[PDB]
Amino acid sequence: YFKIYSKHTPVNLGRDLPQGFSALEPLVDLPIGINITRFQTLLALHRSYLTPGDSSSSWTAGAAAYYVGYLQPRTFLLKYNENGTITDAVDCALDPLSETKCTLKSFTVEKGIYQTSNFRVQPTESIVRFPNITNLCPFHEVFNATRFASVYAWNRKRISNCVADYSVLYNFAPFFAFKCYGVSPTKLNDLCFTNVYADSFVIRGNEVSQIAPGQTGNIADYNYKLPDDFTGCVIAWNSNKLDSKVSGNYNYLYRLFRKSKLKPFERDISTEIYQAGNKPCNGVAGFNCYFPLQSYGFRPTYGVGHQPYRVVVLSFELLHAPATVCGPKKSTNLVKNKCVNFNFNGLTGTGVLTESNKKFLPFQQFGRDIADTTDAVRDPQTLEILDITPCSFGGVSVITPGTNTSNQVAVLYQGVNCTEVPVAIHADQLTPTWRVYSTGSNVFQTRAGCLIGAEYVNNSYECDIPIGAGICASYQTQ
């Protein structure tokens, strides 16, 4: 919806934004559902006047009679009149006294010490570390070869335990379309399967499109077979410079005649005559007796199609077997004494990484206290003891006198250290909104936590508002 609130307010004498409160009422809305990233206004450009000249910016003033603001999501308390109108309101992200007004539903707060919220510091980045990572797969041994087989006799390349590196597959030398049966062209390295069956051969370019589920022809009936639900891809490229003789390579054959169809991934490589008609040849090879395999007859000077086009298949499968071929993403660097979202081979936690004095045995990868909590983790490719330290969470109190006697407050950050993080209270890192206190003036330290906004006095007065560990705050006259 695009609801538009409205209230004509001519009570103003002309002053820019007079101090007060009012209520707004809406009128209409309608749906569009469009992404928007530009805001502009349109004038009655045929009549322009009262436009002065200036160069004001960065919190200055210059006569415009226009006002622009950008709204934000806030929690916000209202007061309803007995008639029903709105008489007063506060927001819970401005000042500690406002948050105190919000934690207990009233417009007045009395003397004492309260509780508002926590101030847990957020992480800065994320890091991932993996095994040394290597023993990768020699997939280059497939494409880079001079012994490419035939369609009626192909090679079966099964990939054993290694690391699946697909960087040289789509990013390097992508001669033709990927022709992915079922896989993400971008997420090739992300998800991995058990084993890959690779076959290399040559067919006609016009017959290259025949390599797809549910497609038949001269090569998909007896020579080569594919499952309908095949997963993986096929890579094709020109090979005119590979196999092109003066007369052309005739050693490549294709099956054309057979008694029945072909089972999925079956090789019927054989040399026998075909029983055509009523001539059961027993070596005659004469009338109605021909060899099912027919010479391809390569032509170096011919155009597309008949030119050597080599296709290598990748038969993926997802079977309930241990992972064999998988390529993980490269492990990032390491940080110390910085709150980050560390990940160590399936150990995604947040906190601070520091060097540990422990002496893990050669078969130790975790570490625990008696809490069922992860304590120390060994680096997968540095072989040392990396200790784990949590974040710097803690609560926030607020010390105030009566709201109708004073308006200034002091905030106690219990269980933390002003030498630690909260002194550098900054936007987008600390949940509390007010990053406005200098955190260098009127800063004091106490066993229960460091206190902001009060000055230690070496007098001795009876306790008014207890704090803890003997320190007792109070309002006073200087």
Partner: antibody, heavy 123, light 108 residues
């Protein structure tokens, strides 16, 4: 980035054995075969040695068949020739290279040659 | 064994002229089986071309490959006078062999 290093010059007498070292770093020592050639003034290079990395399969040349033996260390990625049957004037330089003609896993004929070489040893 | 017959005995020509390197096959070499090796005086050998003319280490405009089928050769245009390197050609169809050899002098 590739760092191939070798030992220094040596002097050896006939009847003993000469040891030659070639250390490799910067590239994965699992998928590239190790080749060893001999170069001397007045002639070109040879095909004295060829070893893989996954297995201990050898491709020694027919000229020096049964007379060359070299070990391969995957931890330090080092080729160690322990050449025997020393002869009086076998003084020539030896070069270790990362082959790109036969793979270290299957071993078919690749498209390439000795793109990366070592620094050489003198005996 | 099959060896390659090379007859560039000496290219006694000044730098900046067209140069021809011969790698005539003995009986038969595949189209996709060729390697070119560079050897500057007192340096480690290095591969130049892993095929006919496809570049491996830079090769801005000098080293080129030509031919097809059984016969092949190398063409040099606008040679830079510093190199004066030794060029070898290698076949891959039968084990691993090197060429006869090539010498290029100063040509003052």
């Amino acid at each position: 980035q590739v760092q191939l290093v070798q030992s220094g010059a040596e002097v050896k007498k006939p009847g003993a054995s000469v040891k030659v070292s070639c250390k490799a770093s910067g590239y994965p020592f699992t998928s590239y075969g190790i080749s060893w050639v001999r170069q001397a003034p007045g002639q070109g290079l040879e095909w004295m040695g060829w070893i893989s990395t996954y297995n201990g399969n050898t491709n020694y040349a027919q000229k020096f068949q049964g007379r060359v033996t070299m070990t391969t260390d995957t931890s330090t990625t080092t080729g160690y020739m322990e050449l025997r049957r020393l002869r009086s004037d076998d003084t020539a330089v030896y070069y270790c290279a990362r082959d790109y003609t036969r793979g270290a896993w299957f071993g078919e004929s690749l498209i390439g040659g000795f793109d990366n070489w070592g620094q050489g040893t003198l005996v | 064994e099959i060896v390659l017959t090379q007859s560039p005995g000496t290219l006694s020509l000044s730098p900046g002229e067209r140069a021809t390197l011969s790698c005539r096959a003995s009986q038969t070499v595949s189209s996709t089986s060729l390697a070119w090796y560079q050897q500057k005086p007192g340096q480690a050998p290095r591969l130049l071309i892993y095929g006919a003319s496809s570049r491996a280490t830079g090769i801005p405009d000098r080293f080129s490959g030509s031919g097809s089928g059984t016969d092949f050769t190398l063409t040099i245009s606008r040679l830079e006078p510093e190199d004066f390197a030794v060029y070898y050609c290698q076949q891959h169809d039968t084990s691993l062999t090197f060429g006869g050899g090539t010498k290029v002098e100063i040509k003052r």
